[PDB]
Amino acid sequence: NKYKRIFLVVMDSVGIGEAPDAEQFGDLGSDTIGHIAEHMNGLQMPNMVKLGLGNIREMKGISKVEKPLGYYTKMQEKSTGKDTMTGHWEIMGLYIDTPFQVFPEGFPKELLDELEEKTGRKIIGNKPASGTEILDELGQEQMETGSLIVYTSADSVLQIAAHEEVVPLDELYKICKIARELTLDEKYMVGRVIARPFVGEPGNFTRTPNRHDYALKPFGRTVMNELKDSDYDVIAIGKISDIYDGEGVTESLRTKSNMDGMDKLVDTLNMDFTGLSFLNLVDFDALFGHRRDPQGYGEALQEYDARLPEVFAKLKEDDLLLITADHGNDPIHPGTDHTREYVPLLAYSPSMKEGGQELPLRQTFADIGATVAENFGVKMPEYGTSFLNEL
């Protein structure tokens, strides 16, 4: 192998400007990093700058440097959708024609009618909501009537809440499985069906740890599958395991925050493995992008950038670091959905003694997967062109 370990970091939703097909998505003018840099009156990301972020594109506070630490370019998304699952599946070598759907006005009557017909239960709610808000609103009705609370978030999910002492847990899971089958349909395709059992009483409802997720498997065998099948290590940190429904994963490290994600990254750098360490930093998307909060987004980016010198100090000569994103989620944009954007790509190894250069623009995210596959000598994915030899 040219690299013994590859550390792949997805900064979730950290887009670097509207993509060529942005218009098809109503995403003209979108620019995640750029609008944040403007809001902040200049972003302080000196370590990303040293890697060459500003060389990809200059933005307020983010300037190009003469001798970037690593190689740099941006990546264009080829798949139809702009959701997390699509982006990640493409990164690991897939092409996804069918987008996952979001439901800002709740779910179509047709879907809910079929779920009712298959379960024998009424459905109440049917709107985007936090799990807390929705429980206070409808928790008591749910208890009294044996109804299912069905709701969504700004993401592609269908959540089903039910009191544990009214609807038995195993029945809630059965219902979620029925919903999971019904939602395998392009009309209403959800990335994730989530059981949200709760207990307590009106004015004091708490969601229990008996939560279960029903994700779809990637539409194809990924580069992670191939690494795993060739006895390499595939360490998933954060949401990565869930995003791929565990496919190709040899070890999974739960995280509770961006800083916690960086701690786990540091843990893997202390590990003697051969293969891929794969981190998703999710706060950018879940806490700031969807909530349209450029101030908190900007602070999160600075907090993350400050963690980077430790990562640099720990990389070995045969380690490669890859930093990218999976779409945009511009916090100064209409609505609550993702934005169709280019994503940055930074590729750094301490063995690059002369620094890096610009790479040709990556025409699919799958170039990352192809690079990983070629490095480890596993079967090349169907999509993607490796840039391994450019490094």
Ligand SMILES: O=P(O)(O)OC[C@@H]1CC[C@@H](O)O1
């Ligand atoms: O509002 P909730 O119930 O806390 O969930 C919000 C989203 C739903 C699933 C995950 O995206 O987090």
Ligand SMILES: [Mn+2]
């Ligand atoms: Mn838009």
Ligand SMILES: [Mn+2]
């Ligand atoms: Mn995402």
Ligand SMILES: [Mn+2]
């Ligand atoms: Mn999202």
